[PDB]
From Swiss-Prot:
Subcellular location: Secreted
Other remarks on this protein: Was identified as a high-confidence drug target.
Organism: Mycobacterium tuberculosis (strain ATCC 25618 / H37Rv)
Species lineage: Bacteria, Bacillati, Actinomycetota, Actinomycetes, Mycobacteriales
Protein name: Peptidoglycan endopeptidase RipA
Quaternary structure annotation from Swiss-Prot or TrEMBL: Monomer. Interacts with RpfB and PBP1A (ponA1) via residues 448-472 of RipA, interacts with RpfE. Interacts with the chaperone MoxR1. RipA-MoxR1 interaction in the cytoplasm leads to proper folding of RipA, resulting in its secretion. Also interacts with Mce2B.
Length: 201
């Protein structure tokens, strides 16, 4: 019969539509898991980038300190020399200096310079070590931000895939309801026809 084969086609169409809704549902769950996973990776990468920013800030502060140490030492030595000179035989000390006094004085001054240079060289070396660590930390930062940025991208993709799959699910759900109602109404019609057709036989 031409009827009973349109009912059969509808049984099949409703079955297909439901199977596809289910398959889209399973896809949704997998996208969901990938988005949740992607969000954990954003978080851990954000924390690593935060720790890298802290390292960098700490390293820059050590450099500022090293610089301050150099400025302070230079000033201490400059003050030492200036105080010695002001209270010395060229200024405040008015009495005669023998040849030996003069020689002691320049040798003291030469000694002070040599000592000052040795201390400053050490401070300059230390400063250099701080500038290096800052460079190291600045790069470890750049890597960490990059890594955080890449995690955000992965998340954004996973969010887009999931949103699209839910878009498909929603439309498939409408199709299912439509085919269901239509399959219902076809059987109803067929039944109705059978009752009428029997009522007169």
């Amino acid at each position: 019969d031409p009827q009973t084969d349109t009912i059969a086609a509808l049984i099949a169409d409703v079955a297909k539509a439901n199977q596809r809704l289910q398959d889209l549902s399973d896809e949704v769950q997998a996208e969901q898991e990938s988005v949740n996973k992607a969000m954990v990776d954003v978080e851990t990468a954000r924390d690593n980038a935060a720790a890298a920013e802290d390292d960098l800030e700490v390293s820059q502060r050590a450099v500022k300190d090293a610089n301050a140490a150099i400025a302070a030492a230079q000033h201490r030595f400059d003050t030492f020399a200036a105080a010695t000179y002001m209270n010395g035989p060229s200024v405040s000390y008015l009495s005669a200096s023998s040849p030996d006094e003069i020689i002691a004085t320049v040798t003291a001054a030469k000694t002070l310079s040599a000592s000052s240079q040795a201390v400053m060289a050490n401070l300059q070396r230390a400063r250099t070590e701080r500038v290096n660590t800052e460079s190291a930390a600045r790069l470890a930062k750049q890597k960490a931000d990059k890594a955080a940025a890449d995690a955000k991208a992965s998340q954004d993709a996973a969010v887009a895939a999931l949103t699209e799959t839910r878009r498909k699910f929603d439309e498939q759900r409408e199709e299912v309801q439509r085919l269901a109602a239509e399959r219902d109404a076809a059987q109803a019609r067929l039944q109705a026809a059978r009752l009428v057709a029997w009522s007169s036989e």
